[PDB]
Symmetry: D3
């Protein structure tokens, strides 16, 4: 089924929010299939944020995403992409609603805790998952509790 | 004797370990439990609970779901209680329920959507569902003292 | 398998701790098979606390257990009786360790939140479950997640 | 920012044991406590705090409530705090507040709505409410080192 | 009881955003907040607070720490509070504290052990520490109505 | 470069939705994550991880369990970290683990006991298990700034 790249940004890691974020996505019933603590180098960052290469915030973006380790993940479940952006709330954490990840934990745009593939960008999920993870690092399993999450 | 609403952790809620989490949002919200029963819904009881959907495609699978494992059936009392419960639960379809609600936090399905609560917008749905699942000998008439601090 | 009678006392109910207690016992992997919000009358109380009928605290005990509603339960799982008294902690909540129900939520002996059949009293569990619940009120089901809780 | 706002757990939040949850909420949001006092509010102080309401029918009910038990008074600081805190609280009427907010998880009353927070849409309310509850000697000037991860600048 | 104890989130607990968790812990235990102040501790006050330690080798490191950032000072009241609070905290050395206690869930240092609480085994420590941090005008006398369910008498 | 311990949410931890809850107790405790990998353990890898129990009755069922679903494999850094982790996890047999520990709170079995962490009392178990499950290219050398407030 549908998967999406999700990553806890260096602010999240530094602020010790990996658990809380993982718990939010497990508790929503979703299935972790890839998971990796790693540091993003500047060539990986440049390739990740490519779409923003002309923007005035780019150099600060790569600077930040490269400023400490992240926890990179793939998640699978029904409608996962969009479900995950709903959990995360709005991109600017100062605008995110309470009960979402950024509404609860951030109030900044740059240091906004987390990233999730944009479902409105068709193919963003598969392209980012293939950026961060090799097929060898992604795990096919059956989460048994899926029989009670879904009809 | 204030406003009561019927509320049900569905078999998926029970399977996934979520009874206490749901109960905790109801009491934390300040609502009072007056009935509470762990039970299996038999097929007649579900025909009656879901009589209004008998014509609809999803009916058969709805009756099979709601009888496919035990439920936790509840009655909850408090000011504007039906509607407060519908807001805590969020959208019937959990893929659209807002994060912070019970379905936005815990579910990713419309059939397997954790819980039921009476629809305040269907007039007398509460009184009827309560009366369907509970005898008046299993509702409990009590005063929750912290009520004195929940309301003015 | 083994079941045990567990009940949230009127202090627990009044203090809005039913959820938290239920969650603790579901999260430990145990299976709810009976569950009932009810009031204990004085004949049920007298029969429940019979063993304490001579003690100086009896009349205060029945008075309290009868002072508001309780939430009466049966729980099943491996070694359930003893596992549950371990969750509850010590009878006097002022002596219970932090991380147990009474260590976290009480500090009184009388108003000590909760009751669980005493595993050291052989047959206490079956005798109390049959006191509070008829066989019609207890549910036989398969909690699927039991396949991951137990070998 | 040096942006500060005044925040108060009201006598109901205090009585229901929710001082800690409200504080975790604000801390977890990355906001910096700079003032904080457990205290009783008396007649004069409530009449001034609420005086914008002196001509209103719920006024006497309100001074009676806000004076019926202790409150936890506070000041918090951070980017857009006054506004962020207001969003965290939810609608003034808890029965209208969205689940996820303080009021939507914990209240369903208008009078007993847990909590108060300076109105960002009333210019000066924050600095006025703070100077009401706190002398400048009771506010702390410090650096929450985690701020460098909450914010980029 | 009128049994009160002095409790302090230390500068590490304050910086790590744990004021709220510690307060929820105490509230949830059914204990009554009667005093509470966010504040900075200076030289004189620490030298007196800790003076039983004036002759010890960790003393200078300790005044430096307890003075390196703000603390949340408190007073709590209830049955056997001083002792209950001490058990809630766990061993003074967090790396020795049992999981379930404040120190065992959140610390693993001796210097930076989150929190302080009057020693019930030192007679007078509670009433002495409280009078140290609080004037009697800053303590509140009230009735937590839930107390009637926490206790039978 | 301080003390590191290897820690593993076992397949049951992963199935039951407990990865984040465990990770949250490790970070809340102040320990630093330096490695972290969601993976399936193959049979050779489990022969090596459990070589010391190869003679024992429970070995075969142990290798079948630990390969029966994916795991979350971690490395954790901090003062006295091996032993701090063994205390957070509590007794190997979860029916005896104390409430407050990860096993006392979440488990009721000895085989299905949620997590593994290196035994501080077996000298060099940490360095060896870490080296077994992680290449040195997947350990991350970083400074967690709130360390400045966790320790003196
Ligand atoms: N003015 C801006 C815009 C975006 N950004 C950051 O760059 C990231 C990617 O931007 P984006 O438009 O793809 O937003 P999302 O897909 O993450 O919602 C955001 O998450 C922001 O953190 C920023 O720092 N400043
Ligand atoms: N296509 C549909 C529509 C509803 N249903 C289920 O049947 C239930 C009752 O539908 P309903 O519109 O009366 O919803 P509620 O009153 O529970 O909000 C829902 O909770 C859905 O779980 C379904 O399974 N499939
Ligand atoms: N001195 C005492 C002893 C017991 N009790 C209460 O009576 C209950 C039953 O006593 P018990 O000796 O069977 O203790 P448990 O089986 O509940 O551990 C306890 O839970 C106490 O609440 C009391 O109020 N005062
Ligand atoms: N009709 C009303 C309106 C407000 N109030 C109370 O009075 C307070 C102050 O009114 P307000 O419009 O300034 O509300 P906020 O500034 O707290 O959002 C509220 O928090 C309500 O508790 C009331 O009791 N009845
Ligand atoms: N060897 C030691 C002993 C204590 N201390 C610190 O000094 C404080 C006071 O010592 P204490 O024996 O009165 O400890 P408590 O009364 O807080 O249990 C402790 O909380 C430790 O933080 C230290 O830094 N080094
Ligand atoms: N009879 C036994 C004993 C141990 N074991 C399992 O094998 C694991 C390793 O045993 P161990 O004594 O080396 O324990 P730890 O180093 O993980 O504390 C345990 O975590 C138990 O789950 C078992 O399945 N059956
Ligand atoms: Mg984009
Ligand atoms: Mg309907
Ligand atoms: Mg007994
Ligand atoms: Mg071993």
């Amino acid at each position: 089924d549908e998967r999406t790249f999700v990553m806890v940004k260096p602010d999240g890691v530094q602020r010790g929010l990996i658990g809380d974020i993982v718990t939010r996505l497990e508790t929503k019933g979703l299935k972790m299939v890839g998971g990796k603590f790693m540091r993003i180098d500047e060539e990986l960052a440049h390739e990740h944020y490519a779409e923003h290469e002309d923007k005035p915030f780019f150099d600060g973006l790569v600077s930040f995403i490269t400023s400490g380790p992240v926890f990179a993940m793939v998640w699978e479940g029904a409608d996962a992409t969009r479900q995950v952006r709903q959990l995360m709330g709005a991109t600017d954490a100062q605008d995110a609603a309470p009960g979402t990840i950024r509404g609860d934990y951030g109030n900044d745009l740059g240091h906004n805790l987390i990233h999730g593939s944009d479902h409105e960008d068709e193919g963003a999920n598969e392209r980012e998952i293939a950026l961060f993870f090799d097929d060898d690092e992604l795990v096919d399993w059956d989460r048994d509790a899926s029989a009670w999450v879904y009809e």
